[PDB]
């Protein structure tokens, strides 16, 4: 078919007949309550998503240097793209399919994989009505479509479509992604160099209600909360690196402690090497994490590529399926492994959870980890991201009631560890809701059940910023002193108040449980 | 079932 600059591998889905094998929808009523479009998309507006033709042209969200950039399609090794979906609408899945194949060279495509992960949508299922097998056969050849008879979640559909590629390399995308040009070749070409790099593309967005394309999407620099999940470096954070890498060219790759999951391109024989996924991970989260350690300690190298973007719909009001609620809390206990003394933070923060994580098989990966000599967490915090706010739990001096004896009464979240709610004073129960801890680097008085809230001057819990608007000192007579203002917090009249710093008053003399944790996290029993 | 976009 006629192929050239936006169509690498020609038109895609053209009939015989001459008429496009997809019927795009009309414009989008003019009474659409987006909330409720936002719900029958499962996250997106499926009314604009089908409207909008798949070959859809996309900003080039790259800096300019990256397009002065050369690259030898001959000498880079082909790669397996792997996309895998559980009822993603046509249109979404298709433009995804079509932006892969419209803007990646077919000398360096060996394939596009698509993996259904149980789907039950009527256009995926194998007895529905066939939209999408009879649309793939207007597609490539190289485009294949593998199923899981029933849906394992997105490490074993991840693994079902890794398994059966044939590259050397493979990348995997989201199945709502739109590509900016020469996204892959950047890839390619540093892995090509070092097999043990896995490298991912800066993301990009895609409004979900308008599906304008966004700037800005994840970026490159990531941490971790102590919620188990990926965080993008905060300004202080950013501040303490070295500084020549405080502001790197727009080209140099750059590591990252963490990665966004399941936009990574990685060789096929390292990825296996360094222990490939956790197969016991369960439906939706944190194999980005779990994986993002074990790389990092297992020899390999987490980098960010500037020059390799994609765009991606942010779900927004909505989620596009059904995970079980305890899936997500058993992948943060399958984590918690690999942060070594460190997990009695992160289990604490979760809020201490009981739940079957399958024992007997995370013992095996144990052995695994030992077998293959990889580091400790602390090697990771001290020398992957030694510019969190916790490198050792030494950070981390204070964990319990904050307790004021003269009136005999802990401070308490009020229900809501979420930010934005105004904290309290309650007679003392040991619950989770009276548990404070402190971050000495920044000062951050938080409840240990969100490390993105932070204690105020003004009584109240707000998002957790580095910056003098947060810090507190604790003194050694049992003062909480907002450092900015040298005034001193105080539960006089069962109120939270501000008051001249005086050690002799006991309605500002606070008692807050000192942070000990062993040496050795011992998991909870089933 | 989300992972949110940097601010
Ligand atoms: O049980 C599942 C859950 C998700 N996915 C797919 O995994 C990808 C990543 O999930 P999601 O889009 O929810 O994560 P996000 O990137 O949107 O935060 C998507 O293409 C989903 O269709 C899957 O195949 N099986
Ligand atoms: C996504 O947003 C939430 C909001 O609470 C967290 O800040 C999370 O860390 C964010 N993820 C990224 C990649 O920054
Ligand atoms: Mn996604
Ligand atoms: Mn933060």
């Given at each position: 078919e006629g192929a050239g600059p936006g169509r690498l591998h020609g038109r895609l889905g053209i009939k015989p007949d001459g008429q496009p094998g997809y019927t795009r929808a009309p414009s989008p009523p003019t009474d659409l309550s987006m909330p409720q479009a936002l719900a029958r998309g499962g996250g997106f507006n499926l009314y604009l998503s089908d409207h909008l033709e798949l070959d859809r042209t996309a900003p080039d969200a790259r800096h300019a240097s990256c397009r002065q950039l050369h690259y030898d399609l001959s000498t880079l090794p082909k790669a397996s793209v792997i996309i895998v979906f559980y009822n993603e609408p046509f249109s979404t899945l298709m433009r995804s399919v079509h932006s892969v194949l419209n803007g990646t060279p077919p000398q360096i495509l060996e394939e596009l994989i698509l993996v259904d992960d149980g789907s039950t949508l009527p256009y995926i299922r194998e007895d529905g009505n066939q939209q999408l097998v009879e649309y793939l056969k207007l597609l490539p050849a190289k485009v294949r479509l593998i199923r899981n008879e029933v849906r394992k979640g997105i490490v074993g559909a991840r693994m079902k479509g890794i398994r059966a590629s044939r590259a050397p390399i493979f990348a995997i995308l989201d199945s709502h992604i739109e590509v900016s040009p020469q996204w892959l070749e950047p890839l390619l070409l540093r892995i090509k160099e070092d097999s043990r790099r896995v490298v991912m593309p800066q993301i990009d967005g895609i409004d979900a209600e308008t599906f304008k394309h966004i700037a800005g999407g994840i970026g490159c620099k990531l941490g971790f909360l102590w919620k188990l999940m990926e965080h993008s470096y905060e300004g202080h954070q950013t501040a303490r690196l070295p500084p020549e890498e405080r502001q790197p060219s727009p080209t140099d790759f750059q590591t990252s402690p963490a990665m966004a999951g399941g936009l990574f391109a990685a060789n096929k024989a390292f990825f296996f090497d360094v222990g490939?996924?956790?197969?016991?991970?369960?439906?939706?989260?944190?194999e980005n994490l779990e994986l993002s350690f074990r790389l990092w300690q297992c020899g390999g190298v987490l980098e960010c590529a500037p020059c390799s973007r994609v765009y991606h719909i942010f779900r927004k009001g909505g989620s596009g399926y059904s995970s079980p609620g305890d899936s997500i809390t058993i992948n943060k206990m399958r984590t918690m492994l690999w942060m070594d003394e460190y997990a009695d933070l992160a289990w604490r923060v979760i809020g201490k959870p009981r739940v079957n994580y399958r024992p007997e098989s995370l013992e095996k990966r144990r052995e695994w980890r030992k077998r293959k000599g990889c580091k400790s967490f602390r090697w990771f915090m001290e020398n992957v991201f030694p510019e969190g706010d916790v490198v050792t739990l030494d950070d981390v001096p204070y964990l319990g009631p904050l307790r004021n004896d003269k009136i005999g009464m802990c401070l308490d979240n009020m229900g809501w560890a979420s930010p934005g709610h105004a904290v309290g004073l309650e007679y003392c129960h040991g619950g989770d809701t009276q548990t404070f801890m402190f971050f000495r680097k920044v000062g951050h008085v938080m409840p240990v059940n969100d490390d993105e809230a932070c204690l105020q001057p003004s009584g109240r819990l707000d998002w957790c910023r580095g910056t003098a608007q947060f810090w507190w000192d604790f003194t050694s007579s049992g003062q909480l002193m907002f450092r900015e203002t040298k005034q001193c917090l105080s539960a006089f009249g069962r109120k939270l108040r501000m008051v001249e710093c005086d050690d002799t008053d006991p309605y500002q003399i606070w008692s807050w449980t000192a942070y000990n944790p062993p040496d050795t996290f011992t998991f909870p029993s089933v | 079932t989300t992972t949110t976009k940097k601010p």
């Open positions: 490939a996924y956790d197969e016991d991970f369960q439906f939706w989260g944190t | -």
